[PDB]
Structures are given as structure tokens and as C-alpha cells.
């Protein structure tokens, strides 16, 4: 097979270097052994039969932040990854990942919950259990379907596959049988009344998920040509139109200091709608009209002119008014920023409250009280995760001694650059000393009581033992958590075992031999 | 076919509880399950989106940032001067000290990069005058004035690149 490995890798680059327009980001390991290289598309005639099996390049309007992550996902995601792209991926590693998926999917079915409930903590609607959902079952039982939508130059992970299962984010069907429908608008699921309401022809259609469904004459006549015949559909009774389009609102989220809601029920010009165009009952249309006629008078909302997004900004304290400017939101899949208004930025107030710690020692934290790296902490620290700080404090104190042994004047710098927690108002005289005093340092180990010296020492002694118990491999992971003062990884514990290694590996590799996995272990 | 026994034996027919139909008694069950588990391990983090006929439903798991620095005040406190020509008064307060202290700082950085590398600055220029003026004298301090007093057009023809 060693000969075959070369026959693959030699022909592999032939496939890449012909098909990758971006090889430099793929394999930047060598730059001078080749020019800067790209690949270029060219117009072509098409056979009237063979191209039927092709698919479209796009079905949607794509923004710039997606295009980069899509081309990056197309080519470079796997080339830089450890496991490698799905193309040249071995059967064994694909098979290993496939077990861990199955081990996770059944835990979700073991709950009996639904799709939307797991994701959402205040769901509007609730769909199916997952024992009945065909898609989730189709993914669980067939491994190849997991790989179809995953692009060839992409990595084969667990998280990406479970996304499809717990959310069917698939778009239209880009067969050459489907009809490209233009108007596809997607409103939020709180503007809806009954789900049985008639189908908005202007808005998004369920038929686009499969071209075989939108392969009817009406769809082809719509996009490809103009109409000549007016075809009449049965209308609805004035009662049935309303009954479908009834909305219901919390009575407590009616107050005049929330314009995100109240402006939904006024025209563009600034005139109140009827209940019908508002999709409401009688009393809920009263309780809003009072608030408009009152909010008009507190000048949040206009009397007669056009509604403005500044008016649509609901009222609240300075923080939620200020933070929402300061709050820049970033995907963790993709480093780009969401522009304001382009995303629902989320916060459970009740959960943050209940997520706090019911156990707290304010005295134990008086040492680290003035010390803070971040602006403020929304966390109420435990006893354990407090010890981590006092050891961080001890550490920075040790290096001051390390530098002072080499001659550095420690007191000289701490007068110029140390930043107090309490900063007065900024003026022309205060801003230069304080902008130099940005840094936050611990106190001297010398100017202390023994118990204050003991805790910083004992705290350092605890975590020094844990990292000895923790293996060496996951050096960085401790350093990620060491900043944010998370102590879970630091909490490791291995238990005793009387079994010999030969009995172990002979037993484990036997097990794995059944599922495949001819490759034994080596420890 | 498509049928097993263990699903039948592990099954146990029972009677319906309040959970199956009644929301409040059901939602009390759901919260007891989500406490132990964390969705982000199963799905990473993403725009948690689900789409009905034409209706979406979102609860993304993002990373929030709040960048703050004391210099960002810009001395712009609200003092009735939001608009009117009283506004532009609020800008021209430090419009003198702010200019001057800036011009101080290019001359720091420019000079430090020129002092530290006068030699290459002297050497790289002379190599170019030779190709233009081969086998002749090269008065640096005199010819250096021709590196500057030239217009943007003439500077290109001799030196091959343009700056001012």
C-alpha cells in the first residue's frame, strides 16, 4: 500500500491543482516552489441531455460574510484541519465519528422531547418528537446522507451533522426541475395566527424544498413566461379571514415605554389601524390605543409623521440603551460581526439570576476585590474558582521578584503604570496620567500579613498539585480556562485499577475488532 | 420486517399523565431535563433557527463584547449643546491642543526611523544617482535637496517611484 499512497498523493495534487483556485491558503507550506496560482472558469455550450443531472450555483441572495465562509468551507477548511477533508478521509475515522453521533442522537430520543424545545427555552410552537421525525431518523440510520450536503473540501465533524438533525436549514432544491421563485420573504413566528392559514403566494413556499413538488404547470407558467388567463380561486368569508389572522399579546408587555411592539399597529403615515388590519381582538386594540395616544404625548412616537427606526427603539434604562451600541455580536463559527438589527441578541434575565451561586463568602473575596482584569464580572465566584485568582495573584508577585533579582526597579513602574479601580472624572490634566496608568497589578508579597501571604502561597500549592495530576498534553486548555477562572478542567481525578495493560488492550482492541477498526491501539 | 423485540419488551403500556396534553405540567418536565444537559456540546454554537411555512424562530448563541477605554469620552458630555451652532463650540474646545500634540508625534516616529537608519538612507540614494549620473561627484547634502524640490512627475522619471 506504501506504493499506492504515492499514487494517491501524486494524483491528489493533480485533482487539487486543477480544481482549487485557492491552493496558497490550502498549502501555504511552500510558496517559492511555484508561482501564485488560481483557476478560471470559462463559458461552455451544454449538451441538451447530459447537463440535466447538474445543479445550480445559488438559490438565494448571499451576503459577503457568507461567501468567504462558503468558499473557505469549500476548499480550505479541511486542508488545514487535522483529520483532513472528507474526500481523502479514511473509512476508519469516518466510522469512529459515526458511533459518537449515534451515541448522542439516542440520548435526545431518550428524553422524548421535540426539536424546537431542546434549542429554545421559551418556544412559541412545538413540533414532533424525534422518534417520529423522518429526517432525524433518516440521518441516524444512513451514514452517507450525513455526507451529501457536507461539501467535499469540508471537515467531517459531529457538531455539523447534529445541526442538520436538530435544525433543517436546507434551502431550495437546485435541481434543473425546480422553478426559481423570486419573492421569498420570511417573517417571524409571532406575527402568525393559525398555522392553517392560506398560503401567501408572495412569500416563501414549502414547495421549494423539493423540485418534484414545484414541477407543476403553475410554477413553470409563473417564472418562465407571462400570464394570459385569470384563474379564480375560492375566497374566504370575512369571518374566516379574521379567525385565521388573530394574534394575541401579553397584557403586561403593553406599556408605552416599549415601541418595538406598539409601532407594529400603526400605518406608515402614523395613523392607528383597525383591529382587523392589526390582527387583534377588541380589548387588546383598546389597551394599545391608550398607549399610543399617551406615547404620542411623551414624544417617543410621533403624532402624524412617518415612523422612524429611532422611534422603533423601545425604551429602557441607559444600560440596555448604551450596551446595545457597545454590544458587538460575533458568530463563533465565523469571526464577522452582525450589524445591529440583523440578529436577535439574546438574554434570559431569569436564568442569569438563577444561574448565580447560592453559596458565597464575601470575606474570602476581599483580597481579590480590588484586583480585576475585566471591567466587571457577572459571576458570583465559588470558593474553588476564587482560589485560582489568589494563585494568579501569587504568580504575578513571583515575577516581580524575578525581575527585581535582575535589577529592575519595581516600585518605579508601579507608580507610573498601575491603575487604581477608582478613577475620577476625566479632564485635560487627568487623562495623560490615567491613560498611562492602564495596568492592574497585585500588591507586594512583602507588605503583607502572614495569613495574606499564606493564602496566596497555599492557593498556589493546591493548583500546583492538580497540574501534576493533569497530563501534559492539554497544556493550552488549562491556559484558556486559567484566564476566565474556570476550574473544571483543573478538577481532574483518575481512579485506581488492578487490570494489566495487556489484559486491557487485548480486551479493547477485541471489542473494536467487531465494529471494524482493524488498527489496534498503541500506548 | 423493520421490527425488533426489545422495543416491544422494553415497552410497557401505561395510562396518560398530565404531561402528554397539558402544557404547564409538561413544561415543568422539560425544565427538569435541560438543567443537566448543554445544547452547545451537541451543536456547537450557531444561529439556532427553525423554519415553518414562512416563519422562523431564532435563539443564537453568540459571543458578546463590550469594548471600553477611558479616552473614548472625547470630552463629549451632554451639556445642552447637541445642536445649533452651540454644538460646533463643543468641538473647537480641544481642536488646538489635539492638532499640535499630533504633529509632535509624527516627528518623533519619523525621526527615530531616520536616525536609526541614516546609513542605508545615505547608501540607497547614492546607488541611484550613479545610474543617473555615472562616474561623477555626488554631494549628498546638495543632491538631497533635489530628492525633495522636484515635482511628482520629475521625481518619477529619475527615481522610478512616486512619493509626493
Amino acid at each position: 500500500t506504501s506504493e499506492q499512497l504515492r499514487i494517491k498523493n501524486l494524483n491528489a495534487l493533480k485533482h487539487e491543482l486543477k480544481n482549487n483556485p485557492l491552493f496558497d491558503r490550502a498549502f501555504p507550506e511552500y510558496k517559492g516552489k511555484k508561482p501564485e496560482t488560481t483557476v478560471v472558469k470559462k463559458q461552455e455550450e451544454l449538451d441538451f441531455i447530459r447537463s440535466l443531472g447538474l445543479k445550480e450555483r445559488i438559490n438565494k441572495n448571499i451576503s459577503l460574510e457568507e461567501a468567504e465562509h462558503q468558499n473557505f468551507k469549500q476548499f480550505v477548511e479541511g486542508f488545514r484541519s487535522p483529520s483532513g477533508p472528507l474526500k481523502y478521509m479514511d473509512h476508519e475515522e469516518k466510522q469512529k465519528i459515526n458511533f459518537l453521533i449515534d451515541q448522542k442522537l439516542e440520548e435526545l430520543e431518550a428524553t422524548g422531547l421535540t426539536r424546537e424545545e431542546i434549542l429554545y427555552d421559551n418556544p412559541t410552537h412545538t413540533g414532533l418528537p424525534l422518534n417520529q421525525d423522518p429526517f432525524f431518523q433518516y440521518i441516524k440510520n444512513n451514514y452517507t446522507a450525513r455526507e451529501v450536503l457536507l461539501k467535499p473540501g469540508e471537515e467531517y465533524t459531529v457538531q455539523k451533522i447534529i445541526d442538520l438533525a436538530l435544525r433543517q436549514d436546507i434551502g431550495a432544491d437546485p435541481s434543473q426541475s425546480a422553478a426559481k421563485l423570486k419573492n421569498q420573504k420570511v417573517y417571524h413566528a409571532s406575527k402568525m395566527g393559525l398555522p392553517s392559514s392560506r398560503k401567501n403566494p408572495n412569500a416563501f413556499d414549502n414547495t421549494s424544498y423539493l423540485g418534484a413538488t414545484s414541477s407543476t404547470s403553475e410554477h413553470y407558467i409563473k417564472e418562465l413566461v407571462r400570464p394570459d388567463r385569470k384563474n379564480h380561486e375560492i375566497p374566504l368569508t370575512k369571518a374566516q379571514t379574521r379567525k385565521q389572522s388573530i394574534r394575541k399579546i401579553n397584557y403586561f408587555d403593553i406599556h408605552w415605554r416599549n415601541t418595538e411592539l406598539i409601532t407594529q399597529f400603526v400605518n406608515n403615515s402614523g395613523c392607528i389601524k383597525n383591529k382587523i388590519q392589526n390582527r387583534l381582538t377588541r380589548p387588546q386594540q383598546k389597551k394599545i390605543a391608550r398607549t399610543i395616544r399617551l406615547s404620542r404625548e411623551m414624544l417617543l412616537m410621533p403624532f402624524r409623521g412617518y415612523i422612524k427606526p429611532s422611534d422603533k427603539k423601545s425604551l429602557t434604562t441607559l444600560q440596555e440603551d448604551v450596551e446595545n451600541t457597545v454590544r458587538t455580536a460575533i458568530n463563533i463559527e465565523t469571526g464577522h460581526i452582525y450589524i445591529k438589527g440583523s440578529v436577535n441578541e439574546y438574554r434570559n434575565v431569569t436564568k442569569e439570576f438563577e444561574n448565580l451561586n447560592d453559596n458565597f463568602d464575601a470575606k474570602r473575596a476581599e483580597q481579590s476585590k480590588d484586583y480585576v482584569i475585566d471591567g466587571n464580572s457577572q459571576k458570583l465566584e465559588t470558593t474553588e474558582e476564587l482560589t485560582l485568582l489568589e494563585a494568579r495573584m501569587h504568580s504575578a508577585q513571583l515575577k516581580e521578584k524575578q525581575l527585581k533579582d535582575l535589577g529592575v526597579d519595581t516600585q518605579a513602574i508601579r507608580e507610573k503604570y498601575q491603575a487604581s479601580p477608582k478613577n475620577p472624572q476625566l479632564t485635560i490634566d487627568n487623562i495623560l496620567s490615567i491613560q498611562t496608568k492602564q495596568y492592574i497589578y497585585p500588591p507586594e508579597f512583602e507588605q503583607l500579613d502572614k495569613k495574606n501571604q499564606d493564602q496566596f502561597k497555599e492557593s498556589f500549592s493546591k493548583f500546583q498539585e492538580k497540574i501534576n495530576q493533569v497530563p501534559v498534553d492539554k497544556f493550552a486548555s488549562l491556559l484558556v480556562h486559567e484566564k476566565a477562572t474556570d476550574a473544571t478542567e483543573f478538577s481532574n481525578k483518575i481512579q485506581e485499577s488492578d487490570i494489566s495493560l495487556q489484559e486491557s488492550l487485548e480486551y479493547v482492541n477485541q471489542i473494536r475488532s467487531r465494529g471494524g477498526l482493524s488498527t489496534p491501539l498503541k500506548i | 420486517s423493520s421490527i425488533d423485540i426489545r422495543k416491544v419488551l422494553n415497552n410497557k403500556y401505561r395510562d396518560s399523565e398530565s404531561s402528554d396534553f397539558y402544557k404547564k405540567n409538561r413544561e415543568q418536565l422539560v425544565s427538569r431535563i435541560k438543567q443537566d444537559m448543554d445544547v452547545d456540546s451537541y451543536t456547537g454554537a450557531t444561529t439556532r433557527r427553525t423554519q415553518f411555512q414562512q416563519y422562523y424562530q431564532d435563539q443564537p448563541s453568540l459571543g458578546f463584547v463590550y469594548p471600553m477605554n477611558p479616552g473614548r469620552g472625547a470630552f463629549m458630555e451632554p451639556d445642552c449643546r447637541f445642536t445649533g451652532n452651540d454644538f460646533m463650540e463643543k468641538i473647537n474646545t480641544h481642536f488646538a491642543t489635539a492638532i499640535t500634540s499630533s504633529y509632535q508625534d509624527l516627528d518623533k516616529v519619523v525621526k527615530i526611523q531616520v536616525n536609526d537608519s541614516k546609513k542605508n538612507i545615505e547608501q540607497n540614494l547614492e546607488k541611484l544617482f550613479r545610474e543617473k549620473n555615472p562616474n561623477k561627484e555626488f554631494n549628498f547634502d546638495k543632491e538631497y535637496a533635489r530628492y525633495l524640490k522636484l515635482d511628482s512627475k520629475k521625481f518619477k522619471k529619475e527615481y522610478g517611484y512616486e512619493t509626493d
Binding site: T124, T126, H188, S190, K248, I249, N250, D253, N258, E260, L261, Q264, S314 | D20, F21, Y22, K23, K24, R26
Partner: peptide
Amino acid sequence: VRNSKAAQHQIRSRNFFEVDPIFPDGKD
């Protein structure tokens, strides 16, 4: 809030009865 919806707890999740299915598959 921009998206408000009232919890209609009187509504029941599971229908206690059967119905002719609306959108079947095949003709069984």
C-alpha cells in the same frame, strides 16, 4: 418586546382523538 405571544395554556398539545390525515403519502 418586538415578538410577544401569549401562552394559551388552555390549548392542549395532543389531540385526544383521530382524524382523516390531511396530507398523506401514497394511496394506502
